[PDB]
Structure formats: structure tokens, C-alpha cells
């Protein structure tokens, strides 16, 4: 019953700084079908056993999705640090859920759709867990104000991925967050 298809099988994914969230409620999910899928390079769960997922019920499941580099997939995990974890998409230390990643070079790179995926490069502070920042204000690195323009010691905050791997290649990522204060296994 759970519409994971719209999430995993969308033709374009979100940029990581503007990561997508879908709320999954009032349905049945067969997690083992996903876990056993040969398509995924990464399928790592935290706070729950991957096999026991079909036995559990949760209040809601949130599916967050985006594209990053293969060598950034390690940052989508509890307790990690780096450009992605700090400034784009942050998991909490006590994360309960699964992180699924697969190579999307043929869809997302210049040999495929040649999509424009971006990331945030500068930020005043690290993101809180599951916080999202889609602002495009000029970032002030020095003491002098930017006044809305990329002048002296001022920087546009986003940059497009090049993808030029596999560490350099685009990976699509789906994070499943399991909220229990509706969505069960078969």
C-alpha cells in the first residue's frame, strides 16, 4: 500500500541543499523487498534491524531524497561531519531509520540528463537534524557587509556539482525516518 515508488523512481531528484521530504502514512510496507533489491549500493539501518522491519509498526515514515557524490554518501549517517552533514542534510545522533543509496551516473551526470544539482558551500552555523535551508543570501566571510552583492569577501552560497568515479559520480539517496510516538509490515 505504501507509495515508495514515487520516491525511489522519480525522474529528477532534489538537490541536497533543498532535499525532498515525503510523509508515508496509513499503508503497509514490505521492507524486505527493498532490502533484498540488487539495485542499491547502500542499505544501512540504525536503531532497527533491517530484517525485523516487516514486524514493526510506526506512527509515520518520512522519506527524504536527494543526490550527492558517492564519496559523500558516508556523511548520511548519525554522528557524521562534512560539507553535506554540516550545511545540507543532517541526521540526528539518535537516528532511527535506514539510509539507501544507489549509483545514478547514467541518469544524473553529463552522460544522462545533465541535470543541475547543487549544494550549499558556506553557512553561518551547522544545520540542526532534519533542518532545511534553501536561502540564497550572499555569505559574508569577512567583517564587511555584503549588501546583497558578491563583493569583497562575499560569496554566493551554492555551487553546482560537477561529477567528474565512482567516488565522483552522482548517487541518489533515500533516507527513511521511522517515527513512533499506521505504517506496518505485512
Amino acid at each position: 500500500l505504501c507509495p515508495f515508488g514515487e520516491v525511489f523512481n522519480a525522474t529528477r531528484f532534489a538537490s541536497v541543499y533543498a532535499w525532498n521530504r515525503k510523509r508515508i502514512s496509513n499503508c503497509v510496507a514490505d521492507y524486505s523487498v527493498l532490502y533484498n533489491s540488487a539495485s542499491f549500493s547502500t542499505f544501512k539501518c540504525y536503531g532497527v534491524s533491517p530484517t525485523k522491519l516487516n514486524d514493526l509498526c510506526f506512527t509515520n515514515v518520512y522519506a527524504d531524497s536527494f543526490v550527492i557524490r558517492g564519496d559523500e554518501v558516508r556523511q548520511i549517517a548519525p554522528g557524521q561531519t562534512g560539507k553535506i552533514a554540516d550545511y545540507n542534510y543532517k541526521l540526528p545522533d539518535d537516528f532511527t531509520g535506514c539510509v539507501i543509496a544507489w549509483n545514478s551516473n547514467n541518469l544524473d551526470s553529463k552522460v544522462g540528463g545533465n541535470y543541475n544539482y547543487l549544494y550549499r558551500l558556506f553557512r553561518k552555523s551547522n544545520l540542526k537534524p532534519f533542518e532545511r535551508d534553501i536561502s540564497t543570501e550572499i555569505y559574508q566571510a569577512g567583517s564587511t557587509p555584503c549588501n546583497g552583492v558578491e563583493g569583497f569577501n562575499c560569496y554566493f552560497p551554492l555551487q553546482s556539482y560537477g561529477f567528474q568515479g565512482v567516488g565522483y559520480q552522482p548517487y541518489r539517496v533515500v533516507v527513511l525516518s521511522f517515527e513512533l510516538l499506521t505504517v506496518c509490515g505485512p
Partner: nanobody
Amino acid sequence: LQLVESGGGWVQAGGSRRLSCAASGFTLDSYAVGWFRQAPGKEREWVSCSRSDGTTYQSDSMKGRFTISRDNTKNTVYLQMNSLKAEDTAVYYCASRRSYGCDYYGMEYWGKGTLVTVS
């Protein structure tokens, strides 16, 4: 918990000098490290940043004369200063924070500084 600058001293104008920032009490693998400077009577100025992945960005003011670099093995961050002029005279400070990049207002740890005087 500690940043210690060294390598300061007297330089002749046009010359070079390399400052070092040694971090102890943590590995800077997850920390941004920045160099700042304060000239007498002036506001503190940002000089450059070495991100936690080794990439860098630096102040337009320096006209590409300084380059920052890091060596996580020695847990040290360097500032290579070239073509020094008299207005580069200042106390140079190393600073860090647990973040990918630096920030002028949000640095979390500071060294005591080291003086660089250009003739």
C-alpha cells in the same frame, strides 16, 4: 582545545614567511581552521580558511599573496605569506570551529597569536 601559532618575527618587505598553527586536544579532521590578523588600531581581519576537507578560500584583500594549507598528520595548518609589505604588520591568529568552513563571527577556539613585523 588548544591552538598555538608560531613562525612569526621580523621580515624584510618583499620577503616571505611561513606561519604554523599546531592544534592539540583534537584532530582537525572535522574542523575548519582560519587565519585572522589584527593590526594596531584596526578591526580584526579575516585572512583565509582551510576547510575540513583541505579546500581553501581566502580574502580578496591579499591579492593572492598568501596561501593556507594543512597537514592533518602533524595536525598543523600553515599560512605561507609572500611579497610582504609594511601594512601586513600585525598579530596573526589561528582559529578553528567544528564546521566544514570558517566564519568571521562563529569561530569556537583561538590561539594567542604571533607577531609578524615587515620592515
